[PDB]
Amino acid sequence: MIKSLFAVIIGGSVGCTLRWLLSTKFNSLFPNLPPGTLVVNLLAGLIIGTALAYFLRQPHLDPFWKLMITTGLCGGLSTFATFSVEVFALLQAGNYIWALTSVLVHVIGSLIMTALGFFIITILF
Amino acid sequence: IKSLFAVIIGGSVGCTLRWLLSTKFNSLFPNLPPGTLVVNLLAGLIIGTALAYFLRQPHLDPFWKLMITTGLCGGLSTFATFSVEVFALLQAGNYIWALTSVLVHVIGSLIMTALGFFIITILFA
Amino acid sequence: SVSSVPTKLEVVAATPTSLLISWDAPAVTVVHYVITYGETGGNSPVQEFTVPGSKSTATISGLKPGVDYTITVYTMYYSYSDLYSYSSPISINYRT
Amino acid sequence: SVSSVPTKLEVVAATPTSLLISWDAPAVTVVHYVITYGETGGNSPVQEFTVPGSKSTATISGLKPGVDYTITVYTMYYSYSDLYSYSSPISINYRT
Ligand SMILES: CCCCCCCCCCO[C@@H]1O[C@H](CO)[C@@H](O[C@H]2O[C@H](CO)[C@@H](O)[C@H](O)[C@H]2O)[C@H](O)[C@H]1O
Ligand SMILES: CCCCCCCCCCO[C@@H]1O[C@H](CO)[C@@H](O[C@H]2O[C@H](CO)[C@@H](O)[C@H](O)[C@H]2O)[C@H](O)[C@H]1O
Ligand SMILES: CCCCCCCCCCO[C@@H]1O[C@H](CO)[C@@H](O[C@H]2O[C@H](CO)[C@@H](O)[C@H](O)[C@H]2O)[C@H](O)[C@H]1O
Ligand SMILES: [Br-]
Ligand SMILES: [Br-]
Ligand SMILES: [F-]
Ligand SMILES: [F-]
Ligand code: NA
């Protein structure tokens, strides 16, 4: 479990650091739907989608690498909690129209990036 | 750099918690993996408590705020795993449990964020 | 680097005992604005109330005719870095 | 610890040139099942087709009378650790 632990911490730190860097640079550019929190959720949705189709065709990959890409990178890169307060803050600010828009774009958009990631590697392979 | 260590330390603890909770519990109910849900609800409760609490302590070191929010709540919650679980249910034709997972994660996280916020708000009043 | 402080605070309409103030929202998510007002001269108790973040105007009532008032506005806003926090104030003086 | 292999594979109805098979779903998210079949005497090409993850029965057609067939089912399933992967098969033999 210790070698598996290093896979989570390493990929997680890279995902968290990426999310923290992208968020502090781009979120304030558009407060009604902070694009940094969106992009890291879209990107993590893309990566996890490619990982879904790629791991299926490479069943002998070391679980160390699979753990570092998904639970580590995508897990540390994406975020549900910051997505929550953003929608909460919009609700408390009476900005319902953008709270609903934030909920839809993240949910619908992450799945599409997951589908895009999955079907692209599937069409390639 | 001191902010980088706050994200890495907080993110590593959050990612480690999500990795352990998800493996132990996701297989118990695969139609809506409860390990992925619990880390998302818990990160919402924390981020909601943090929302109310930090508002009233303006002199708090930003090192602690960044480690609990961008760090812990960011590594702990996940949108990517939430994505593949819904994507996998959609490909499995299990449309009702795909929608249910979307509603329970979104609606459930916003409620825990409210609970974290109002419990602290009602307590200070 | 985006200011959370409101700009262009001005009185748009007045009566001897009331003031209707308006401002430009800052380019953030304001949850509510705090409006404070008091008699500019010396030690009069400054009073304050909140206005929801969607509104950018507010009425100040119960003033005395022919008195100088200092009015300030600041926000309770959400940002990524600071979660919920308060902005600096923008302030004007107005005589009823 | 949760098995992704189907259980209780069996022919539930049979004609001389077709088989109705069924199985118990494993306790995981199955995206689809893969059914394999072919003459047991390893002198025939094995064929494969898929049925959706919601179904638990499948019809095998185009068989020969009085011939021994090997039938297997495995899953393409999602799990947390492995994402999409294929399970080990469950296999039966049946003579038409
Ligand atoms: C479907 C899933 C749901 C999950 C849970 C959602 C929780 C939402 C919390 C909302 O918080 C409240 O929002 C009101 C509305 O924004 C605010 O009212 C304030 O703002 C309003 C809108 O401007 C004014 O009308 C009010 O007078 C003023 O008190 C109020 O302070 C605030 O605490
Ligand atoms: C809210 C929108 C989010 C973004 C879009 C996400 C799209 C996710 C589903 C797409 O994947 C397809 O889903 C079909 C439906 O599950 C599957 O059909 C499979 O299963 C069906 C079950 O009825 C059969 O009818 C089909 O023939 C069979 O190909 C198909 O294989 C699969 O590739
Ligand atoms: C699924 C559940 C959905 C519903 C969730 C709850 C929504 C209704 C809350 C009622 O209580 C509110 O509490 C706020 C404080 O928490 C008060 O805000 C007042 O004080 C705030 C600051 O504490 C300001 O920001 C507000 O503008 C000001 O109206 C507000 O008046 C009051 O009505
Ligand atoms: Br976060
Ligand atoms: Br993940
Ligand atoms: F969350
Ligand atoms: F995602
Ligand atoms: Na995350």
Residue numbers in the entry:
A (entry chain B): 1 to 125
B (entry chain A): 2 to 126
C (entry chain C), D (entry chain D): 1 to 96
Copy text from the publication.
Microbes are protected from the cytoplasmic accumulation of environmental fluoride ion (F-) by export of the toxic anion via fluoride channels known as Flucs. These small, homodimeric ion channels are remarkable proteins in two regards: first, their unusual ‘dual-topology’ architecture, in which the two subunits of the homodimer are arranged antiparallel with respect to each other, yielding a double-barreled pair of pores related by twofold symmetry; second, the Flucs stand out among anion channels for their extreme substrate selectivity. In contrast to most characterized families of anion channels, which tend to be non-selective among anions and sometimes poorly discriminate against cations, the Flucs are arguably the most selective ion channels known, with >10,000-fold selectivity against the biologically abundant chloride. The protein possesses two deep, aqueous vestibules with an electropositive character due to an absolutely conserved arginine sidechain and a deeply buried sodium ion at the center of the protein.
In order to probe the role of the anion-coordinating sidechains in more detail, we mutated Fluc-Ec2’s bromide-coordinating Ser81 to alanine, threonine, or cysteine, and also constructed a S81A/T82A double mutant. For all four mutants, we measured fluoride channel activity using either single-channel electrophysiology or bulk liposome efflux experiments, and we solved x-ray crystal structures of the mutants together with Br-. S81A had a mild effect, with a ~50% decrease in conductance to 3.7 ± 0.4 pS (seven single-channel measurements), compared to 7 pS for the WT protein. In accord with the fluoride transport experiments, a strong anomalous peak persisted in the S81A structure but was weaker in the S81A/T82A double mutant. The hydrogen bond between the fluoride and the vestibule serine seems to be dispensable, and mutant channels with an alanine at the position retain robust fluoride currents.
